[PDB]
Amino acid sequence: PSPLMGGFGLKHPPPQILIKNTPVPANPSTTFSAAKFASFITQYSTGQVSVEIEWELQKENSKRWNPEIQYTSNYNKSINVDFTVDTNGVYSEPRPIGTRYLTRNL
Amino acid sequence: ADGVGNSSGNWHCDSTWMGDRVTTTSTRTWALPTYNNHLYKQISSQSGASNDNHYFGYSTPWGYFDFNRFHCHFSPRDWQRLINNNWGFRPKRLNFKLFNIQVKEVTQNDGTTTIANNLTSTVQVFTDSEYQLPYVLGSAHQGCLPPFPADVFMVPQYGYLTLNNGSQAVGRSSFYCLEYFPSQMLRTGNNFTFSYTFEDVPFHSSYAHSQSLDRLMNPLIDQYLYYLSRTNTPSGTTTQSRLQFSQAGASDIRDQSRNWLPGPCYRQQRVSKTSADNNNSEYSWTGATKYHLNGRDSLVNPGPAMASHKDDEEKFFPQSGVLIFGKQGSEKTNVDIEKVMITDEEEIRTTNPVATEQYGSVSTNLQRGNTSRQAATADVNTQGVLPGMVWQDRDVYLQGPIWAKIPHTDGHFHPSPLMGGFGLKHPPPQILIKNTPVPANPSTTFSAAKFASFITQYSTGQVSVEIEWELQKENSKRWNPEIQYTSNYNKSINVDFTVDTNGVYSEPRPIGTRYLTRNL
Amino acid sequence: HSQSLDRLMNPLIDQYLYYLSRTNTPSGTTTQSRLQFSQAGASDIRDQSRNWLPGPCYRQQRVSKTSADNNNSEYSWTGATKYHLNGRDSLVNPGPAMASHKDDEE
């Protein structure tokens, strides 16, 4: 049960966190009406969210002699630096980065 | 308690099943306007009304919180879990909470409606735990907690009726000022709570009898008792009077001696769901079943618990003998039959007489031979309680009421509410809530006239009701499977007891509780 | 009691229960059978669904304190309310507790 899109299969994954604004009714009628409220004060919410994850690492213990392939930035000059913002302050991710750079014997 | 910006409560809407108990908790968002412009107004029936419709009373600026319906606490899945597995249930205790109270000030300048917070205004809340106010709960009134937890509801206005001689009052009529009660004042950040314990009440009969009251015998063995089976014998070419007696068995099972009688009856007119089958006349009142009190006729609705119909007559129902619930979007006046859902009380026909038929027959004269007088009988359209009588109460429904207050009277017989539910001498107290009037700008010169100008404002908040119910577990020993409530597997445009594409919650049909079976 | 058994409701709020209010509708220039249902409020307060019933009754003949208003006959026993026991009639006096008269009939 490893996900086909990639990742860790969890029988009990991190739970869904559901958030919504409590409806605030607008001005009601002075006469009682059994119809459910359909007029509300327009509102939204803003705030900060923090996620902290602890990860366990499996340290490489290779005994190969020659150097390995490593992910690296390209030294040549460029208009924009990779994984930074441009003159519009727009953050971009130039390429997908996997994890399989070190080598291990079968 | 929590000033401005600190929540005074949380959303608790759920149910916990633990053995012989189920605790249902519900939270709703309510809106409370200003009623009567902070005034108490004497109200009465309009001039020209009939004597039966005459009334006198008072309208108060207060509202009240009503949760006297099962849908306010049980989800449809909760109801199905309750009725398919339990032979009975009853309420045990409840907890009530008001929290997250916001007072909003409304202003209107040059055609613009502006709403702003009022952090210093209060709302007055008190519970009538001494039952000193007229108990208007238990009259099947609108304004309850909506069945769907996501719906926002308006708090109904409180009002009561007192003695009236026509549209006028009498000296015995009582007036009640709700500000003469101690109430708790709540700003934004204050919360209200109280706990109530239900008195001991019988378990609701959430079962249908698998035996009939007239079929309680052993069909294999004859009785040792005799009954008069014949009154004459062939004599010559004519007849001669001669009494004969037989022991009753299976072939003459109707003549068997019995120990019990069917419950009391108050006959109702029979109406058919097929329109053409009904009489082409206006008989909703002339043919109605009524009781006479102080010169005024009141409709008997639904009246004593009686079976809606006999075998293979499901299209027939008593004229005012069953609860009729409105479908979603149904109007108030003269809606068609397809706009309403008519309940059925056929599960109690084992012990209760059919509503539209007579209780039985009694003798009216004294038969005698040779002048001769033949024996005569009459239908018993109304039957009071007799010794040895057994009956079942009216069923409760998901949309139906839960309880009612037993009137404070010297005598009463079987104080189960006729609309269905639990009769309580001390029911859950009325919870009265109103916005504290905030005077507008006063005159710089003193005026003894009472204030008539106020700042327009309403309040909104959350209400929580938690009820603990005791369960009577089914202990049946029948072999074949039982009837259970179930959803229909076939495909449909909409799922039952859900929202539609407009997000409108609807309850497609009334659900009773009598699906399991128990022997008589 | 300062309340009547048929006036125990809230006159401001309609009931959610329905009652059969009409049994026919105008059809063409004649009438056609058609059942209709309404929710009871203050205007049709007599049709409201109720939980209780008035106490038991054993009807008595009505006599007036104004002599001329009474029938000119001897009806103290023929019109009397009686119970039959072992072949003898006994007067029911005062009998089950019932109101002497309705409004404005002292």
Element (H, E) at B108: strand B86-109
Q: Of B334, B408, B412, which has the smallest distance from its Cβ to C21's Cβ?
A: B334
Closest listed residue to residue B50, CA positions, set B290, B317, B211, B384:
B290
User: B106, A32: Cβ pair inside 8 Å?
Assistant: no
CA nearest to C46 within chain B = B298
What residue type is C91 in one-letter code? L
C-alpha distances in Å from residue B469, one per residue of B20, B243, B278, B298: 8, 59, 43, 35
What is the rounded CA–CA span in Å between residue A27 and residue B458?
7
| Contact assessment for residue B133 and residue B429, using Cβ atoms and an 8 Å cutoff | no
Residues in chain B within 8 Å Cβ distance of C50: 139, 298, 301, 418-419
C12 and B134 within 8 Å at the Cβ level: the answer is no
Distance CA A68, CA B327 (A): 73
State the smallest CA–CA distance between residue B270 and chain A in angstroms.
Answer: 32
How many separate helices (H) and strands (E) can be counted in chain A? 0, 0
Q: Is the Cβ pair C47, B301 closer than 8 Å? A: yes
In whole angstroms, give the CA distance from residue B319 to residue B103: 46
DSSP code string of B291-327: EEETTEEEE--S-S--BS--TT-TTEEESSSS-EEEP
Smallest CA–CA separation between C13 and chain A, in Å? Answer: 7
Residue for token pair 């633990």: B18
Minimal C-alpha gap between C7 and chain B (Å): 6
The strand pair at B389-390 and B261-262 is best described as parallel
Q: How many CB pairs under 8 A join A and C?
A: 4
Q: How far apart are CA B454 and CA B385, in angstroms?
A: 58
Give Dmax (Cα) for chain B: 115
Residues ending a continuous segment of chain C before a break (C–N > 2.5 Å): none
Q: How far is CA B429 from CA A7, A105, B446, in A?
A: 57, 77, 41
For chain A, list residues whose CB is within 8 angstroms of any CB belonging to chain B: 22-34, 36-37, 40-41
Contact B3, B101 (CB under 8 A): no
Instruction: Give CA B22 to chain center in angstroms.
Output: 22
What are the distances in angstroms from CA A39 to CA B7, B245, B253? 24, 78, 66
- Quote the tokens at residue A97: 């980065």
Cis peptide, bond prior to residue B302, ω within 30 of zero: yes
Q: Which residue has the tokens 């009529």?
A: B173
Q: Please state whether beta strands C88-91 and B361-363 pair in parallel, antiparallel, or not at all (unpaired).
A: unpaired
The one-character DSSP state at A4 is T
CB contact under 8 A, A32 and C16: no
| Whole-Å CA distances, B191 to B4, B8, B63, B98 | 13, 6, 17, 6
Q: Which residue, among C13, C59, C35, C48, has the nearest Cα to B300 in the 3D structure?
A: C48
Residue type, B323: L
Residues from chain C contacting residue B384 (CB–CB below 8 Å): 56
Closest-CA distance of chain A to residue B199, Å: 31
SS (H, E, C) C22-87: EEEEEECCEEEEEEEEEECCCCCHHHCCCCCCCCCCCCCCCCCCCHHHCCCCCCCCCCCCEEEECC
Q: Please name which of B414, B464, B475, B473 lies closest in space to residue B8, comparing C-alpha atoms.
A: B464
Cα–Cα distance between C67 and C84 in angstroms, integer? Answer: 30
**CB contact set of B358 (below 8 Å; sequence gap of 6+):** B265, B267, B379, B380, B381
Mutate to test the interface with B, among C1, C5, C13, C22 (most CBs of B within 10 A): C13
Residue with tokens 């994850």: A53
Nearest to C48 by CA among B157, B140, B404: B140
Interface contact B32-A28, CB threshold 8 A: yes
Looking at the DSSP bridge assignments, the partners of residue B113 are B108
Residues 6+ apart with CB under 8 A from B495: none
Nearest by CB to residue C35, choosing from B50, B278, B304, is: B278
Question: Coil, strand, or helix at residue B338?
Answer: helix
Spatial CB neighbours of B103, under 8 Å, sequence gap ≥ 6: B117, B118, B119, B121, B122, B123, B187, B188, B435, B457, B458, B459
Residues of B in contact with C10 (CB under 8 A): 136, 139, 141, 156, 158-160
Contact B12, B134 (CB under 8 A): no
Give how far B76 is from chain A: nearest CA, Å: 19
Neighbours of chain C (3+ CB pairs under 8 A): A, B
On chain B, the residues whose CB falls within 8 A of the CB of A47 are: none
* Helical H segments across B381-467, by residue range: none
Asked if B278 and B298 touch (Cβ cutoff 8 Å), the reply is no
Residues in chain B followed by a break, C to N above 2.5 angstroms: 370
**Contact residues, chain A, for C15 at CB < 8 Å:** none
Give me A45's structure tokens: 């919410």
Selection from B347, B346, B329 nearest residue B338 by Cα: B329
Identify how the structure was determined. cryo-EM
For residues B115 and B174, what is the distance between their CA atoms, to the nearest angstrom? 39
Tell me the two tokens of residue A64: 């190969």
Sorted by sequence, the CB contacts under 8 Å of residue B195 that are 6+ apart come out as: B93, B94, B95, B96
In the numeric block, which tokens belong to residue B60? 């108060």
- Exposure of B182 in the CB half-sphere (CA atoms within 13 A): 2
Contact B422, B393 (CB under 8 A): no
> What is the distance in angstroms between the CA of the first residue and the CA of the last residue of chain C?
18
Per-residue tokens: B406: 């037993």
Please give the C-alpha separations between residue C49 and each of A77, B324, B410, in angstroms, as whole numbers: 87, 10, 23
A26/B146 CB distance under 8 A: no
- Chains with ≥3 Cβ pairs under 8 A against B? A, C
Tokens matching residue B378:
């009459």
Q: Provide the shortest C-alpha distance from residue B258 to chain C (in Å).
A: 26
State the virtual CA torsion across B347, B348, B354, B360 in degrees, nearest 10.
140
Task: Using an 8 Å CB-CB cutoff, list chain C residues near A29.
Answer: none
Tokens 């070419």 belong to B237
DSSP assignment of B491-512 equals --SS-TTSB-TT--B---S---
What is the CA angle B121-B126-B129, rounded to 5?
A: 175
Measured distance CA(B463)–CA(B100) in Å, rounded? 9
Resolution, rounded to a tenth of an Å? Answer: 2.6
For residues B452 and B441, give the distance between their C-alpha atoms in angstroms, rounded to a whole number.
11
Show residues of chain A in contact with C10, CB under 8 Å.
Answer: none
Which residues are CB-neighbours of B291 under 8 A, at least 6 positions away?
B297, B298, B300, C53, C54
Token pair of B39, please? Answer: 């005034």
H-type alpha helices, A8-60 = none
Burial class (CB in 10 A: 0-12, 13-18, 19+), B287: middle
Taking an 8 Å cut-off on Cβ atoms, the answer to whether B279 and C15 are in contact is no
Closest C-alpha among B40, B141, B167, B341 to residue C41: B141
> B53 and C43: CB-CB below 8 Å?
yes
C49 → closest Cβ in B43, B59, B140: B140
C contacts of B319 (beta carbons < 8 Å) = 20
CB contact under 8 A, A34 and C12: no
Q: Which of B51, B306, B324 shows the shortest CA–CA distance to C15?
A: B324
Question: Is the CA virtual torsion B342, B343, B348, B352 positive or negative?
Answer: negative
Exposure string over B440-475, b if 16+ CB within 10 A, otherwise e: eeeeeeeeeeeeeeeebbbbbbbbbbbbbbbbbebe
- What percentage of chain B's residues is helix, strand, coil (to nearest 5)? 5, 35, 60
Of the candidates B275, B330, B332, the beta carbon closest to that of C33 is on: B275
- Classify B255 as helix, strand or coil: helix
* Chain C residues whose beta carbon lies within 8 Å of the beta carbon of residue A32: 12-13
Phi, psi at residue C38, to the nearest 5°? Answer: -135, 155
| Cα–Cα nearest to C44, from B285, B336, B60, A34 | B285
Distance CA B150, CA B146 (A): 8
Cβ atoms of B199 and B403 closer than 8 Å:
no
Whether the bond between B387 and the residue before it is cis, its omega within 30 degrees of 0, is: no
Q: Distance from first CA to last CA of chain B, Å, rounded?
A: 56
Write the secondary structure of B22-91 as one string of H (helix), E (strand) and C (coil): EEEEEEEEEEECCCCCCCCEEEECCCCCCHHHCCEEEEEEEEEEECCCHHHCCCHHHHHHHHCCEEEEEE
User: Which residues share a beta bridge with B291?
Assistant: B298
Can you spell out the DSSP letters for B419-432? Answer: TSSEEESSPSPPEE
Q: How distant is the alpha carbon of residue B51 from its chain centre? A: 26
Of A32, A36, A41, the CB nearest to B157: A32
A24 to B142: CB separation less than 8 angstroms, yes or no: no
Interface list for chain C against chain A, based on CB atoms closer than 8 Å: 12-14, 16
Among candidates C56, C84, C4, C6, which has minimal Cα distance to B264?
C56
CA atoms within 13 A on the CB side of B201: 31
Q: Give, in degrees to the nearest 5, the angle at Cα B338 between C42 and B273.
A: 95
